[PDB]
Coordinates of C-alpha atoms and ligand atoms in Angstrom, one line a residue:
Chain T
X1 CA 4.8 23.9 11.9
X2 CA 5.3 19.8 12.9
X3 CA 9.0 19.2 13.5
X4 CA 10.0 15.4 12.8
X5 CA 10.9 13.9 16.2
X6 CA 13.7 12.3 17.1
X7 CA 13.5 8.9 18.1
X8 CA 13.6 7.7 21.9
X9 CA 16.1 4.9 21.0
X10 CA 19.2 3.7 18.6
X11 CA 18.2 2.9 15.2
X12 CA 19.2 -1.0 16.3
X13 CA 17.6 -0.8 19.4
X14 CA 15.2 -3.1 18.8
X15 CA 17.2 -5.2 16.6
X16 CA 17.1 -8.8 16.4
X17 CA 13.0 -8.3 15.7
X18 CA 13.1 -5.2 13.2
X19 CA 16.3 -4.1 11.3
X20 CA 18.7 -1.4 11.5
X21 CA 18.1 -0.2 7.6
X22 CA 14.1 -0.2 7.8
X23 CA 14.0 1.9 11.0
X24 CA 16.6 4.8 9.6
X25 CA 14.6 5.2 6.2
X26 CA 11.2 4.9 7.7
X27 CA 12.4 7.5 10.3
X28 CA 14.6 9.8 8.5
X29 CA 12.9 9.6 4.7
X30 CA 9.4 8.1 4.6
X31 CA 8.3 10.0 8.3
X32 CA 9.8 13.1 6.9
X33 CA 7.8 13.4 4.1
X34 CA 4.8 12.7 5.4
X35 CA 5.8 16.0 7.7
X36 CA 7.3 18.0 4.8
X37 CA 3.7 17.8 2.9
X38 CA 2.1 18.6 5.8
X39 CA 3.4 21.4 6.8
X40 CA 3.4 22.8 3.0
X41 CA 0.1 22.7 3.1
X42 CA -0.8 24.6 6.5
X43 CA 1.5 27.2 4.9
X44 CA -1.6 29.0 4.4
X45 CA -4.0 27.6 7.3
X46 CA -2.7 29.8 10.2
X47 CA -5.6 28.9 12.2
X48 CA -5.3 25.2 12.1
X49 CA -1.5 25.3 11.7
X50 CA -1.1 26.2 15.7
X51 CA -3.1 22.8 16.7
X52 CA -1.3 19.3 17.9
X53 CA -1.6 16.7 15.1
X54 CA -3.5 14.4 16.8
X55 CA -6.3 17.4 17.2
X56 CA -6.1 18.3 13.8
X57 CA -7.1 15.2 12.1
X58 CA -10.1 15.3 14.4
X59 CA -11.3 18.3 12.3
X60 CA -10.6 17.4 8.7
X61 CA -14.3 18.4 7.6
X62 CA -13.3 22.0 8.5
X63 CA -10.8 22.5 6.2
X64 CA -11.4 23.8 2.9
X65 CA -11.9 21.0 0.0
X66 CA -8.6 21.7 -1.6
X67 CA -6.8 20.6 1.5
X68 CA -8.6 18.2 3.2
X69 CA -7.2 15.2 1.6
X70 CA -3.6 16.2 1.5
X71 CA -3.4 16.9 4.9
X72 CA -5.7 13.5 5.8
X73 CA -2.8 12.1 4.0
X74 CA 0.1 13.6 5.5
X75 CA -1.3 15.0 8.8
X76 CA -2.0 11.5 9.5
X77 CA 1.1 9.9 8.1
X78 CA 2.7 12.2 11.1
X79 CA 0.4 11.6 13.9
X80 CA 0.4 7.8 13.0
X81 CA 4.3 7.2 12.8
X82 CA 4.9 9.5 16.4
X83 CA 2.8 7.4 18.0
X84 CA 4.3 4.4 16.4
X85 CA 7.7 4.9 17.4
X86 CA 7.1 6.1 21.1
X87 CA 5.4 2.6 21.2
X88 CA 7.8 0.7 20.5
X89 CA 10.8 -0.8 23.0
X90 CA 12.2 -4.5 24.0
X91 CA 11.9 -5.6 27.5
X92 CA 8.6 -4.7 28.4
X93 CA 5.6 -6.6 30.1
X94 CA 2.1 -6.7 29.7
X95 CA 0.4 -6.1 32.9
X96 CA -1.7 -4.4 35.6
X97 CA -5.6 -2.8 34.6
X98 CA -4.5 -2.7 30.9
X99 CA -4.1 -6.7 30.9
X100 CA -6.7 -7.3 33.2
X101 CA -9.2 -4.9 30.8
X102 CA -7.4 -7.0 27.7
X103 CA -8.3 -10.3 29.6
X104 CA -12.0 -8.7 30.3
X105 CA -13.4 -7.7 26.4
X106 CA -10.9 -10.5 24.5
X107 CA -11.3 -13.6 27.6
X108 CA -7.6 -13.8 27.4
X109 CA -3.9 -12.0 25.9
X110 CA -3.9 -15.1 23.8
X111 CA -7.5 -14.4 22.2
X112 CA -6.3 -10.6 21.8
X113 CA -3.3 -11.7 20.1
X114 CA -5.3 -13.7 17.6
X115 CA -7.7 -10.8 16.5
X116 CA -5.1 -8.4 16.5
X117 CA -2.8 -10.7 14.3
X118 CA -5.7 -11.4 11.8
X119 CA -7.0 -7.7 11.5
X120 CA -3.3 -6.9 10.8
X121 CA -3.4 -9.5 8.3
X122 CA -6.5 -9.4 6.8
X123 CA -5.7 -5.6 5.7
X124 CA -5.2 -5.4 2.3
X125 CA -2.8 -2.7 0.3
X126 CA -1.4 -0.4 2.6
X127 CA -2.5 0.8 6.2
X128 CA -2.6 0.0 10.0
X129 CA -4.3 -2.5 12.6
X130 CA -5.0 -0.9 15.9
X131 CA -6.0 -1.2 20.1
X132 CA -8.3 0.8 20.3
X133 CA -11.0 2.3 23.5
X134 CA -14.1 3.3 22.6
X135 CA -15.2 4.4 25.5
X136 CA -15.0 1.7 28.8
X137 CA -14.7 -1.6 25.7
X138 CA -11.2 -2.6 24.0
X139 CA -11.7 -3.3 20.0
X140 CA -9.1 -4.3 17.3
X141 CA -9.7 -2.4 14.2
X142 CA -8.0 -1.5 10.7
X143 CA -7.6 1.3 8.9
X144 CA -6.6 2.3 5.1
X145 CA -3.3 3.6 4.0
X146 CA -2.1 6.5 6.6
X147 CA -6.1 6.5 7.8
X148 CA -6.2 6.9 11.6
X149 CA -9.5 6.0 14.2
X150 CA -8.7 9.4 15.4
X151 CA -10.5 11.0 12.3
X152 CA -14.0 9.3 12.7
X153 CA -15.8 6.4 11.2
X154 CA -17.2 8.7 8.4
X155 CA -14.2 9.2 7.2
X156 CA -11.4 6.5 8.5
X157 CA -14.2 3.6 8.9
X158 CA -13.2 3.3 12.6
X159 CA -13.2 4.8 16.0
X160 CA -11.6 5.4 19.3
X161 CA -8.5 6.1 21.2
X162 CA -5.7 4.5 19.8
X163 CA -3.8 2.6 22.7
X164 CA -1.3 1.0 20.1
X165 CA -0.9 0.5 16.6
X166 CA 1.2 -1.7 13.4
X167 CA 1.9 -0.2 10.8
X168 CA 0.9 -2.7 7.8
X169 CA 2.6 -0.4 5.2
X170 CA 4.9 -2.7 2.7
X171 CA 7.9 -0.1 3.7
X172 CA 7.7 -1.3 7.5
X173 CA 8.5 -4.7 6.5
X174 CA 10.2 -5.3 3.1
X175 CA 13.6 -5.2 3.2
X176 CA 14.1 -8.2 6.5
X177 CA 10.5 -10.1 6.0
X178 CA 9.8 -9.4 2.0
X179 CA 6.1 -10.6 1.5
X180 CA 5.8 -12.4 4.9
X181 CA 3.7 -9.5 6.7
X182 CA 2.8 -12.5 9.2
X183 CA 6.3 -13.5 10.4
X184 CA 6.9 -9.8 10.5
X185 CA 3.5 -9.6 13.0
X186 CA 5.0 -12.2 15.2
X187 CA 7.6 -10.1 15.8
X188 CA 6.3 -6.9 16.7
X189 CA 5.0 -8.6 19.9
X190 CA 8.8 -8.5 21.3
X191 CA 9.0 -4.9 20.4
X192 CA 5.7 -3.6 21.2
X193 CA 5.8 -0.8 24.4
X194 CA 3.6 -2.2 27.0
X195 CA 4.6 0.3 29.3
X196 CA 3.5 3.5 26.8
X197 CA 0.5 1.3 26.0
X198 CA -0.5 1.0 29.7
X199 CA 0.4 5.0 30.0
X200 CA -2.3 5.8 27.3
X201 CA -5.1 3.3 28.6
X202 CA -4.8 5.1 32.0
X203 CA -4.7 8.7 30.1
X204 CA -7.6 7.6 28.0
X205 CA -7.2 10.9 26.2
Chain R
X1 CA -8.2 -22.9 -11.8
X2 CA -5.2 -20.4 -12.4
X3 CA -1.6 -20.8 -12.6
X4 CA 1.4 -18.9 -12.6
X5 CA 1.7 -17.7 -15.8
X6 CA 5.8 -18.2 -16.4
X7 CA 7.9 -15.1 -17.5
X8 CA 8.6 -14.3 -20.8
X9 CA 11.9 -13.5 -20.1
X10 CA 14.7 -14.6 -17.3
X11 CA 14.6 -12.8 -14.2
X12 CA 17.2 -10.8 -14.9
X13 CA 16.6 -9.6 -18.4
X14 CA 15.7 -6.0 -17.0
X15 CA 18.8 -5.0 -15.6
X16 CA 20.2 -2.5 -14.8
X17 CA 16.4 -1.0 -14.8
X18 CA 14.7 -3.5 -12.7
X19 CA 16.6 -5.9 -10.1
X20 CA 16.5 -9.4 -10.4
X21 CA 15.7 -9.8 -7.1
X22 CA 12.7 -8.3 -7.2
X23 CA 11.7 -9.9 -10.2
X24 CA 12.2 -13.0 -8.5
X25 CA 10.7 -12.2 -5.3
X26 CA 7.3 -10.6 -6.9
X27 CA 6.8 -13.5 -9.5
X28 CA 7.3 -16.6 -7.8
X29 CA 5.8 -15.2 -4.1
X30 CA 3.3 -12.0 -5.1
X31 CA 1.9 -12.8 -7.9
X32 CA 1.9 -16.6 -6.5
X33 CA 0.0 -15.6 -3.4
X34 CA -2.8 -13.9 -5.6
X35 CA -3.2 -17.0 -7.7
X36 CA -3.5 -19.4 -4.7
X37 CA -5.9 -16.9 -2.8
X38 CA -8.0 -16.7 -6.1
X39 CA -8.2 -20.2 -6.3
X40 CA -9.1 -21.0 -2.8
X41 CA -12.2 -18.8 -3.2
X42 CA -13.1 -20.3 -6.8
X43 CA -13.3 -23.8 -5.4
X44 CA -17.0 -23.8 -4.5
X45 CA -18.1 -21.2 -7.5
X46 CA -17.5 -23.8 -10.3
X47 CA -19.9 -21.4 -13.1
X48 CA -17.0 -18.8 -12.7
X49 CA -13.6 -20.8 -11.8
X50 CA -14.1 -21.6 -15.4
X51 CA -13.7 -17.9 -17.0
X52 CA -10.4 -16.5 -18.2
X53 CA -9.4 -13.9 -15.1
X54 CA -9.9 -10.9 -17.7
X55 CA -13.2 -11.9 -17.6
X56 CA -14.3 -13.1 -14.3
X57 CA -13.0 -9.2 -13.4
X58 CA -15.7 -7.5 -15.4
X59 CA -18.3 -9.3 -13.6
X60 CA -17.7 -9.2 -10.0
X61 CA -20.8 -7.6 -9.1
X62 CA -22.3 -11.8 -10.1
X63 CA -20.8 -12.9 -7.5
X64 CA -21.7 -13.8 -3.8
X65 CA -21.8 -10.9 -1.6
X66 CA -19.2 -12.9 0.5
X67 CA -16.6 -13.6 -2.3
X68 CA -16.7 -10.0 -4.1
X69 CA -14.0 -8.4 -2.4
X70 CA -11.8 -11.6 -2.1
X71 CA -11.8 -12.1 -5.9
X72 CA -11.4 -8.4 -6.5
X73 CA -8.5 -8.3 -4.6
X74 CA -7.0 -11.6 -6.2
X75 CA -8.3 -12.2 -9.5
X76 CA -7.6 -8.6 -9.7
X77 CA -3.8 -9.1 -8.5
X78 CA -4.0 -11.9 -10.6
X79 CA -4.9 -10.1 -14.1
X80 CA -2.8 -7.0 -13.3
X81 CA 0.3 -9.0 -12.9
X82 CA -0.3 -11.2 -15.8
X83 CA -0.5 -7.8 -17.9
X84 CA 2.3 -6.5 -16.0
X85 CA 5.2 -9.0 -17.1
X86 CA 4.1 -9.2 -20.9
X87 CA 4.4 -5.4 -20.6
X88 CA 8.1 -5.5 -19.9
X89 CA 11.2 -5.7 -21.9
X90 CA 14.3 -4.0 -22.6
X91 CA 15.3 -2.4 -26.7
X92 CA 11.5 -1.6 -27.9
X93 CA 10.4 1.5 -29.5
X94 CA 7.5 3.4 -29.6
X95 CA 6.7 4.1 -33.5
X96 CA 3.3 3.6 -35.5
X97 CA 0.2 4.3 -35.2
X98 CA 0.1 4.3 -30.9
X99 CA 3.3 7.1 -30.9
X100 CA 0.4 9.2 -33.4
X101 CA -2.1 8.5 -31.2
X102 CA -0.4 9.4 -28.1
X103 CA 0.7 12.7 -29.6
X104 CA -3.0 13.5 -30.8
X105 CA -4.5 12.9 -27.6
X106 CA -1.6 14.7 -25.2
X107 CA 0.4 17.2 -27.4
X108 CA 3.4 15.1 -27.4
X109 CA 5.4 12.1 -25.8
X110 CA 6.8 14.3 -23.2
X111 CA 3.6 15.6 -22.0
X112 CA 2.0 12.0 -22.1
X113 CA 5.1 10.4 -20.4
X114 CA 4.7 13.8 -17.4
X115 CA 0.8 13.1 -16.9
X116 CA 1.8 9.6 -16.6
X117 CA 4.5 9.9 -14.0
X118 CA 2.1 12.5 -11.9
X119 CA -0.5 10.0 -11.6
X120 CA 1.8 7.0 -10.8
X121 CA 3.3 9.2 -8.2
X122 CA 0.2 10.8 -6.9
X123 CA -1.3 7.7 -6.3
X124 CA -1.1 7.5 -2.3
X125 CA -0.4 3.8 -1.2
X126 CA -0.6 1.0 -2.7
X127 CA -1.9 1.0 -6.3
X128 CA -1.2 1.2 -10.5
X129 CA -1.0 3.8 -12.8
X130 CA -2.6 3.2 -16.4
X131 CA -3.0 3.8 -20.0
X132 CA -6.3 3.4 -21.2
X133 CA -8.3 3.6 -24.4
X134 CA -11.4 5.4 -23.9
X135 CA -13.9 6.4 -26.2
X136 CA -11.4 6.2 -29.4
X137 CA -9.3 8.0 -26.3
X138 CA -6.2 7.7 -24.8
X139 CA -6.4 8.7 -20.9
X140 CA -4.2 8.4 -17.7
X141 CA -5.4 6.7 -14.7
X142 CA -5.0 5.2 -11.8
X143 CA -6.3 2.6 -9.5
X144 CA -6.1 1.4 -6.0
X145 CA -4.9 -2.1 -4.2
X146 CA -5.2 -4.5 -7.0
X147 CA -8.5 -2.8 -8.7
X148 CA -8.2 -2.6 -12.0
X149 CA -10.0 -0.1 -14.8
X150 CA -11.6 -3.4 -16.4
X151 CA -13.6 -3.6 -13.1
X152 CA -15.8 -0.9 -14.3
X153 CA -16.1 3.4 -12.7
X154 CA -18.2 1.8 -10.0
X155 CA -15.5 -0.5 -8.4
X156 CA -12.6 0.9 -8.8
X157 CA -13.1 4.2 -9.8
X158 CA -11.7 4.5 -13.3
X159 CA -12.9 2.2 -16.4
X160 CA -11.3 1.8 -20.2
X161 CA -8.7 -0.8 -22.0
X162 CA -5.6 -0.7 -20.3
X163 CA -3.1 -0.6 -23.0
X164 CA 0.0 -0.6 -20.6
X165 CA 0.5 -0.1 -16.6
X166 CA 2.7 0.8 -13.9
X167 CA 2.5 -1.4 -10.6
X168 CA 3.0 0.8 -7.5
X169 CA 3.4 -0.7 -4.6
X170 CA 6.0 -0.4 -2.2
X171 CA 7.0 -4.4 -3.1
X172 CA 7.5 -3.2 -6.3
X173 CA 10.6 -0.7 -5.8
X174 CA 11.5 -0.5 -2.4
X175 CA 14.3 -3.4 -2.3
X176 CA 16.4 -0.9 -4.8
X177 CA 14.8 2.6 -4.8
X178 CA 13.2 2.5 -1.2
X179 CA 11.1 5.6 -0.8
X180 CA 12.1 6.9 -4.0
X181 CA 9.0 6.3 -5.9
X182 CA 10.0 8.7 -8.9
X183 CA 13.5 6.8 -9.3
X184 CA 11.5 4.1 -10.1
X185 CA 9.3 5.4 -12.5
X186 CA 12.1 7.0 -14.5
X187 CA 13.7 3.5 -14.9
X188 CA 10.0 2.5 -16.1
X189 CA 10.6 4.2 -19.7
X190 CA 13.5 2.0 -20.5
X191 CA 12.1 -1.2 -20.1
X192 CA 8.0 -0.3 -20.9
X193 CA 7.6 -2.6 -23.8
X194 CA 6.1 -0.7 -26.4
X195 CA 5.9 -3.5 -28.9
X196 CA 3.1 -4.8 -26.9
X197 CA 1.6 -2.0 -25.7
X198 CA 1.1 -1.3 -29.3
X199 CA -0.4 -4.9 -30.3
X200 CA -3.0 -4.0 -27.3
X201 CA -3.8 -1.0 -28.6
X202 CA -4.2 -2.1 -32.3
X203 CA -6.5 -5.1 -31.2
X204 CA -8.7 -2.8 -28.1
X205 CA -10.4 -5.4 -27.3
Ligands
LIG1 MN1 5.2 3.7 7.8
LIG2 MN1 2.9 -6.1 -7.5

């Protein structure tokens, strides 16, 4: 079974940029749902109940009909927000082979900013904007509701390693930034964890 | 062009159901955003910034490959919240002919008001849950994003006359009930305006 992780920092640690409230409810509530469903439905799935998430949602096609889209759902919804939180954290610098690589497929941090910061934008309803490596070249992609590039093109629409992600869902953002997803964009930059970003380029798996 | 259609009521005419703020917040900056977005795309299709939004959304497949999804998106935000705010208000009734015809086609208003409730809260991210005449039917459905059943089975995977709907997305509810989607829901029944979910039904067209 998943357990729901604990997070790596306070509740306000990365408070002035995202509040208190939203990071104890999206934690404690929405993330735990997301893990509650999923593990209700690997109740009966010994053999894929004993994988990592992350692996799991690399084999949805194998599961049988009935479950495929729950656990897309909610497996996901659990890979996405561990992965989320561990990259998050103030004080950090973008730097080394992972700004050089940003600097080589975007020209500069500034263009990469820009294309991130519209794909998160441009994503309509609920979902995600990610950094992702598909193979030696950097993209910025989208996905839909709790959709990860993990899972394939066929079904997700994208592709590759996820090196960082933003969660676009209306619940990440509400409560401090209402309907401006854009000034809540702008901040993520001064929480986003370069140094578990860089850790994952270099891993590449 | 569009406009903000103005409430037929003061913001906070639905408590304790629905929160003022919210009201406030989805009229005048949502559904505002929708209109403006809609616009912006109609300026250079002057055969169709003429149509009444109802209608412009049953013929989205007339449009330029480029401005499809746009307009979907918007016009569609655009006629679902229009729909949405005349289908609100507190003291109403269901009686007459739509109460019998509720009863004929699910057993009973209990059953009707459960199926309605599952698919509102099965509806993973962001979407609306519907009533729909059908083939001299009454169904339950639900859409995603902004899509509504007007748009036809092909787009948005559900077609019929909406008689009454349920907006779901996290804007909607998470200021007061947060994650708790099926709070929300609840609160629904007390301020669904059956008087005009009955006109609807009586005209079906
Ligand atoms: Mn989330
Ligand atoms: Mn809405």
């Amino acid at each position: 079974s998943y357990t729901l992780p604990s997070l790596p920092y306070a509740y306000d640690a990365l408070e002035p940029h995202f509040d208190k409230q939203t990071m104890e409810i999206h934690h404690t509530k929405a993330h735990q749902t997301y893990v509650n469903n999923a593990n209700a439905a690997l109740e009966s799935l010994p053999e894929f109940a004993n994988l990592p998430v992350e692996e799991l949602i690399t084999k949805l096609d194998q599961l049988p009909a009935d479950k495929k889209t729950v656990l897309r759902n909610n497996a996901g919804g659990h890979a996405n927000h561990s992965l989320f939180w561990k990259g998050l954290k103030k004080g950090t610098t973008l730097q080394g082979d992972l700004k050089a690589a940003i600097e080589r497929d975007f020209g500069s941090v500034d263009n990469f900013k820009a294309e991130f910061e519209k794909a998160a934008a441009s994503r309509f309803g609920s979902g995600w904007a990610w950094l992702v490596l598909k193979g030696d070249k950097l993209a910025v992609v989208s996905t839909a509701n709790q959709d990860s590039p993990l899972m394939g093109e066929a079904i997700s629409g994208a592709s590759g390693f996820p090196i960082m992600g933003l969660d676009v869902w209306e619940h990440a953002y509400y409560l401090k930034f209402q309907n401006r997803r854009p000034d809540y964009i702008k901040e993520f930059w001064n929480v986003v964890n370069w140094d578990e970003a860089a850790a994952r380029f270099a891993a590449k798996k």
